[PDB]
Design a protein around this motif. Structure first.
Motif, PDB file in Angstrom:
ATOM      1  N   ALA A   1       0.820  -1.206   0.000  1.00 51.98           N
ATOM      2  CA  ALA A   1       0.000   0.000   0.000  1.00 51.98           C
ATOM      3  C   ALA A   1       0.856   1.260   0.000  1.00 51.98           C
ATOM      4  N   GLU A   2       1.902   1.296   0.830  1.00 52.54           N
ATOM      5  CA  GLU A   2       2.748   2.484   0.893  1.00 52.54           C
ATOM      6  C   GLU A   2       3.583   2.638  -0.373  1.00 52.54           C
ATOM      7  N   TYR A   3       3.981   1.522  -0.990  1.00 52.54           N
ATOM      8  CA  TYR A   3       4.731   1.598  -2.239  1.00 52.54           C
ATOM      9  C   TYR A   3       3.870   2.146  -3.371  1.00 52.54           C
ATOM     10  N   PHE A   4       2.617   1.691  -3.460  1.00 54.45           N
ATOM     11  CA  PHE A   4       1.741   2.140  -4.538  1.00 54.45           C
ATOM     12  C   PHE A   4       1.453   3.631  -4.432  1.00 54.45           C
ATOM     13  N   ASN A   5       1.230   4.125  -3.212  1.00 53.72           N
ATOM     14  CA  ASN A   5       1.007   5.554  -3.025  1.00 53.72           C
ATOM     15  C   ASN A   5       2.250   6.357  -3.391  1.00 53.72           C
ATOM     16  N   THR A   6       3.433   5.839  -3.061  1.00 51.49           N
ATOM     17  CA  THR A   6       4.667   6.567  -3.333  1.00 51.49           C
ATOM     18  C   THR A   6       4.917   6.698  -4.831  1.00 51.49           C
ATOM     19  N   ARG A   7       4.833   5.586  -5.567  1.00 51.06           N
ATOM     20  CA  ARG A   7       5.153   5.607  -6.990  1.00 51.06           C
ATOM     21  C   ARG A   7       3.969   6.037  -7.852  1.00 51.06           C
ATOM     22  N   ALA A  17      10.063  -9.607   3.028  1.00 51.50           N
ATOM     23  CA  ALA A  17      11.214  -9.682   2.135  1.00 51.50           C
ATOM     24  C   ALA A  17      10.803 -10.135   0.739  1.00 51.50           C
ATOM     25  N   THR A  18       9.888 -11.103   0.656  1.00 53.02           N
ATOM     26  CA  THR A  18       9.493 -11.646  -0.641  1.00 53.02           C
ATOM     27  C   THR A  18       8.768 -10.603  -1.482  1.00 53.02           C
ATOM     28  N   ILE A  19       7.831  -9.871  -0.875  1.00 53.24           N
ATOM     29  CA  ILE A  19       7.073  -8.876  -1.629  1.00 53.24           C
ATOM     30  C   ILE A  19       7.974  -7.725  -2.061  1.00 53.24           C
ATOM     31  N   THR A  20       8.865  -7.275  -1.174  1.00 53.52           N
ATOM     32  CA  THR A  20       9.754  -6.167  -1.515  1.00 53.52           C
ATOM     33  C   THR A  20      10.709  -6.554  -2.637  1.00 53.52           C
ATOM     34  N   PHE A  25      10.050  -8.985  -5.086  1.00 57.77           N
ATOM     35  CA  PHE A  25       9.271  -9.102  -6.346  1.00 57.77           C
ATOM     36  C   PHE A  25       8.607  -7.835  -6.819  1.00 57.77           C
ATOM     37  N   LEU A  26       8.184  -6.951  -5.932  1.00 57.13           N
ATOM     38  CA  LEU A  26       7.431  -5.810  -6.398  1.00 57.13           C
ATOM     39  C   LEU A  26       8.204  -4.999  -7.388  1.00 57.13           C
ATOM     40  N   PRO A  27       9.470  -4.718  -7.115  1.00 48.95           N
ATOM     41  CA  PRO A  27      10.167  -4.032  -8.188  1.00 48.95           C
ATOM     42  C   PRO A  27      10.311  -4.904  -9.445  1.00 48.95           C
ATOM     43  N   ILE A  28      10.519  -6.192  -9.310  1.00 43.24           N
ATOM     44  CA  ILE A  28      10.631  -6.959 -10.510  1.00 43.24           C
ATOM     45  C   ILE A  28       9.339  -6.924 -11.260  1.00 43.24           C
ATOM     46  N   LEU A  29       8.239  -7.166 -10.573  1.00 42.20           N
ATOM     47  CA  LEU A  29       6.913  -7.155 -11.208  1.00 42.20           C
ATOM     48  C   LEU A  29       6.288  -5.849 -11.662  1.00 42.20           C
ATOM     49  N   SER A  30       6.409  -4.791 -10.889  1.00 45.31           N
ATOM     50  CA  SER A  30       5.721  -3.581 -11.295  1.00 45.31           C
ATOM     51  C   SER A  30       6.221  -3.031 -12.613  1.00 45.31           C
ATOM     52  N   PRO A  31       7.528  -3.018 -12.818  1.00 47.24           N
ATOM     53  CA  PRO A  31       7.915  -2.587 -14.143  1.00 47.24           C
ATOM     54  C   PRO A  31       7.394  -3.497 -15.254  1.00 47.24           C
ATOM     55  N   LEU A  32       7.322  -4.805 -15.056  1.00 39.91           N
ATOM     56  CA  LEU A  32       6.887  -5.681 -16.132  1.00 39.91           C
ATOM     57  C   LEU A  32       5.517  -5.214 -16.500  1.00 39.91           C
ATOM     58  N   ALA A  33       4.752  -4.807 -15.504  1.00 43.77           N
ATOM     59  CA  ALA A  33       3.374  -4.383 -15.749  1.00 43.77           C
ATOM     60  C   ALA A  33       3.304  -3.159 -16.619  1.00 43.77           C
ATOM     61  N   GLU A  34       4.053  -2.149 -16.263  1.00 43.11           N
ATOM     62  CA  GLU A  34       3.995  -0.926 -17.000  1.00 43.11           C
ATOM     63  C   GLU A  34       4.437  -1.147 -18.418  1.00 43.11           C
ATOM     64  N   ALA A  35       5.415  -2.010 -18.624  1.00 40.71           N
ATOM     65  CA  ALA A  35       5.944  -2.177 -19.970  1.00 40.71           C
ATOM     66  C   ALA A  35       4.885  -2.660 -20.919  1.00 40.71           C
ATOM     67  N   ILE A  36       4.092  -3.633 -20.495  1.00 41.02           N
ATOM     68  CA  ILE A  36       2.995  -4.100 -21.324  1.00 41.02           C
ATOM     69  C   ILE A  36       1.924  -3.078 -21.099  1.00 41.02           C
ATOM     70  N   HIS A  37       0.976  -2.966 -21.996  1.00 36.94           N
ATOM     71  CA  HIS A  37      -0.096  -2.046 -21.716  1.00 36.94           C
ATOM     72  C   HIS A  37      -1.104  -2.778 -20.844  1.00 36.94           C
ATOM     73  N   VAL A  38      -0.863  -2.838 -19.534  1.00 33.07           N
ATOM     74  CA  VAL A  38      -1.812  -3.463 -18.606  1.00 33.07           C
ATOM     75  C   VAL A  38      -1.934  -2.555 -17.417  1.00 33.07           C
ATOM     76  N   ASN A  39      -2.990  -2.710 -16.638  1.00 31.31           N
ATOM     77  CA  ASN A  39      -3.104  -1.937 -15.420  1.00 31.31           C
ATOM     78  C   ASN A  39      -1.950  -2.474 -14.610  1.00 31.31           C
ATOM     79  N   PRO A  40      -1.128  -1.610 -14.020  1.00 34.15           N
ATOM     80  CA  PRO A  40      -0.045  -2.200 -13.246  1.00 34.15           C
ATOM     81  C   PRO A  40      -0.674  -2.949 -12.146  1.00 34.15           C
ATOM     82  N   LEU A  41      -1.797  -2.453 -11.696  1.00 33.58           N
ATOM     83  CA  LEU A  41      -2.504  -3.128 -10.659  1.00 33.58           C
ATOM     84  C   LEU A  41      -2.901  -4.520 -11.055  1.00 33.58           C
ATOM     85  N   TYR A  42      -3.240  -4.767 -12.327  1.00 27.44           N
ATOM     86  CA  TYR A  42      -3.719  -6.126 -12.569  1.00 27.44           C
ATOM     87  C   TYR A  42      -2.724  -7.190 -12.132  1.00 27.44           C
ATOM     88  N   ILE A  43      -1.436  -6.869 -12.087  1.00 28.49           N
ATOM     89  CA  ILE A  43      -0.409  -7.827 -11.711  1.00 28.49           C
ATOM     90  C   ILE A  43      -0.076  -7.741 -10.227  1.00 28.49           C
TER      91      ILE A  43
END
Lengths: 506, 506
Positions: free
Chosen positions: B202-208, B415-418, B420-438
């Protein structure tokens, strides 16, 4: 009636009273660094007198530091478990196996049969054996290695003291258990690599004074050994005066021969050596060999094999490597041969006898010391020491030594020396004095920590056996500390001057 | 004969075999990151099957990491004791006081007399009570708070099952103890502040993404609660199928009335409420109130009073503040009134019943996870995930979810979420998808850690009571994990799309 009700709830009222009477310290002084001082004082007050259990007081820094905001609660917990605790776990694995298979009884019985009938000669042998063992391995290591052996003797003598028939029994075990506690005057004082405290001083002096090469093996020993031997002898005499009776004619009957007969009878009752005891001895020898051969200081050890990432493999890794082997070495098969074997020690026997008290207790000392460094308290203490250059010479050395042995009571020895060395070494250079003239009394007095737990982890291991009365060692500690300090000052002024030229400017 | 000798020493040969068969991994690959992978695999192998005790295996990272040079031994020890351990110590102080004064028996007897005669209704009530408790406080907190209450019931029923007269007894306690273990599907999945795992997201999503304000209380609950309630029901059904018998006609006699009579007879035998039990309840309520009122998420709590150094006073400080009060509150005076009073619990009763197994076990997981981050292993895992943008949509979400629930088995949830989140959130933005969907399937699947210890500290607390058979929960975990994952995917595709517009680009 009313006065009686106060006396029964002494601990409850005292805990409340000391918190509120020290409560003005944080709010006053604009809340800058008194919060750490207030936390330090209240924890020390509960350590001197048992208002709360020793391990419970060690958890107080986890409360006051986060609430006061000195350091986050996440960092406080990380300081509770450190390199010493891994060393403790590995040794306790060996200690549990020694007691479980009655290896301590056989060693104690063999020791008694050969020599040591008179009680006064026992503590003299106990000090000499432990001090010589502490010469090479460590202060922390030797404390937990001979303690199971040391107790095996004194519990043995009281059992054999019946002679086919109680305050004498408890005072005897308090003395001998404390003998190993104070048998650190030779543990690193005489050798450069004996303890990490002198190692830090040695590496610092080489770094900042590359030209000077006086600090070397064979030059530190030639002056500390005559000095440190004096503390060992007077510590033996002082401890003999404080505990039991000290009569000069005793050292220089029917009970003695009766005790010998029952002792040798018990040894035959044990029978031949067993497989489990032999394996424990083999792992005992290997553990000591690896510790001694890691950094001998004169021939490179097995650390040269790992000479790519320095400092990664410490002494605790050696303890764990041999310690964890006790959980997988077969001991006795469970002739159906139904399911499987059994290890030398299962975790159930390791969970007991494990000083969980010491792990929390020492952890509290590490966290409290770390909190002092985080807050501007240690720097404040060093700042007050700066305006002291006007003193002639001998004063400052006495001032620092008493100050060194006082601030190491609540802080670990490596932390105390690293803090003071920068404060002290510059003071030295500023005056025209050998910087060394100040460093040696300071670095040698850091090891003199005989009061309270947490000050020295060798003392903490002593608390693990149940004879943890702080008032007894505080009374004994002052006698040893005064003896320890006085001999050091005698050494500095008389014997240590001529070879390093302490009067002349280097 | 020879084949029999191999079978008896299964553990000794297996431990040696797995070390040497995995030994080519470090030497081969030029010794770059396989050393951490080899250490991770050998520790995981000893955790799946009990070749060594669980706590002993947790000490293996203290051996392999320094020798392999991944991180110094000093840093390994610092990772063994963390914020969770301070929370554990504080709760165990309350847990010890509950058992010592027979408070658990009175609560269990009162619960049984009111409702819950049929065993199937007990586990349904146990799940509902624990899950609702886990809604607000924590997954770690609620696991250790109701467990003493939960055991008090099942040991009570087996004692009352005699009826004035054994495999049924052990399977019943394994089920109910596991009910609280798996009663975390409502613990933070439905609430933003339930656990730190979703708080980090939640705090990461608000920040970025400052522009997006969808992530808020009342919007996370409205979709997770219908989804998470499904897991709770099927977990109840699946656990009822795996353990005991599942008959639909049982839920919808002389033994029942006999059990009621003996249960109510025992309640009268306890007698009136005692002073010690009342004090324990008072500290029980205060501890829960402070935890709930720290960060409710909708009204500022008492953390606003300390809103100068954020994050310093965590939940563990609250546990210690009330936990250490049990060592100084008078319990019974020792009518001579000779010396003093006695505390509610002395340290001797705290040293026992204290999960020292869990403290070492969870510490091994923290150190192993930290070693994975220090070495280039976690980054290597994320790098292999990067070439996956060609996949259409639903695949990746399934790939990540199974990958998320697999790599959280050996690492802590934050530790696991922190990682993956950087690994995953960019993958999301790169494709045209809601970053949230991932992000939502990934962050929700992190909490699904039902296999092995160390994966989830709530599971570790379960191991502390002796019914620590890993094979039972691994078998149950796969059923829950598949159920937990499948419901999540059903929620993503059907119910979660319409309100956040998961198909459209935000």
């Amino acid at each position: 009636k009313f006065f009686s009700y106060i006396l029964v709830y002494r601990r409850f009222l005292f805990v409340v009273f000391t918190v509120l009477v020290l409560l003005p310290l944080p709010i006053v002084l604009h809340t800058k660094e008194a919060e750490c001082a207030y936390t330090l004082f209240v924890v020390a007050t509960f350590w001197l007198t048992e208002a709360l259990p020793l391990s419970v007081t060690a958890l107080l820094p986890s409360l006051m530091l986060p609430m006061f905001g000195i350091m986050p609660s996440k960092k406080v917990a990380s300081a509770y478990f450190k390199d010493f605790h891994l060393l403790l776990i590995g040794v306790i694995c060996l200690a549990t196996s020694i007691e479980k298979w009655n290896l301590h009884k056989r060693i104690a019985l063999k020791m008694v049969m050969m020599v040591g009938v008179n009680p006064a000669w026992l503590t003299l042998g106990f000090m000499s054996s432990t001090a010589f063992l502490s010469m090479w391995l460590s202060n922390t290591s030797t404390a937990a290695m001979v303690m199971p052996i040391a107790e095996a003797v004194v519990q043995q003598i009281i059992n054999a003291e019946a002679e086919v028939e109680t305050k004498k029994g408890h005072v005897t075990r308090k003395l001998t258990c404390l003998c190993i506690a104070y048998s650190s005057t030779i543990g690193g004082l005489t050798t450069i690599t004996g303890t990490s405290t002198n190692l830090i001083f040695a590496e610092y002096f080489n770094t900042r004074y590359p030209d000077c090469r006086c600090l070397n093996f064979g030059s530190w020993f030639t002056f500390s050994f005559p000095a440190a031997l004096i503390i060992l002898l007077l510590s033996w005499i002082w401890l003999q005066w404080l505990f039991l009776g000290f009569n000069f004619k005793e050292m220089f009957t029917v009970q003695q021969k009766a005790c010998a007969e029952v002792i040798k009878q018990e040894y035959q009752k044990l029978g031949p050596i067993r497989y489990q005891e032999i394996v424990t001895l083999v792992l005992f020898i290997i553990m000591a060999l690896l510790w001694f051969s890691r950094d001998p200081g004169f021939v490179p050890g097995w650390s040269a094999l790992f000479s790519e990432y320095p400092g990664f493999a410490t002494d605790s890794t050696v303890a764990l490597l041999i310690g964890l082997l006790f959980f997988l070495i077969p001991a006795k098969t469970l002739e159906i041969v139904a399911f499987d074997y059994s290890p030398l020690i299962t975790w159930k026997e390791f969970q007991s006898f494990m000083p969980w008290d010491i792990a929390i207790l020492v952890g509290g000392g590490f966290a409290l010391a770390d909190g002092c460094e985080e807050s501007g308290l240690s720097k404040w203490i060093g700042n007050k020491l700066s305006p002291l250059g006007s003193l002639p010479a001998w004063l400052i050395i006495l001032i620092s030594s008493l100050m060194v042995t006082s601030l190491t009571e609540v802080a670990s020895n490596p932390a105390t020396i690293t803090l003071f060395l920068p404060i002290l070494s510059p003071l030295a250079e500023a005056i025209h004095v050998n910087p060394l003239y100040i460093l040696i009394p300071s670095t040698l007095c850091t090891s003199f920590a005989f009061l309270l737990p947490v000050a020295n982890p060798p003392n903490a291991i002593v608390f693990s056996y149940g004879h943890l009365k702080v008032i007894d060692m505080v009374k004994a500690g002052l006698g040893v500390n005064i003896v320890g300090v006085a001999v050091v000052m005698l050494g500095i002024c008389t014997w240590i001057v001529p070879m390093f030229d302490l009067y002349t400017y280097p």
